[PDB]
Amino acid sequence: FVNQHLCGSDLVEALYLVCGXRGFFYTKPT
Amino acid sequence: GIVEQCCTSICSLYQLENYCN
């Protein structure tokens, strides 16, 4: 993938395809 | 976090796969 920048949704949308579901860690609060 | 890592610079879906439960 070219220019693979993941900001905001692209971070969860990208992880949405990399994980295909099963939940993911697009973020990480305290 | 993975954000700036993928926002300040692009990462690789392979790495994101490491954020999938």
From Swiss-Prot, chain A:
Regions annotated as coiled coil: none
Transmembrane segments: none
Name of the protein described by the UniProt record: Insulin B chain
Species name: Homo sapiens
Curated annotation (Swiss-Prot), chain B:
Location of this fragment in the whole protein: 90 to 110 of 110
Disulfide bonds: 6-11
Organism in which the protein naturally occurs: Homo sapiens
Protein name (database record): Insulin A chain
Lineage: Eukaryota, Metazoa, Chordata, Craniata, Vertebrata
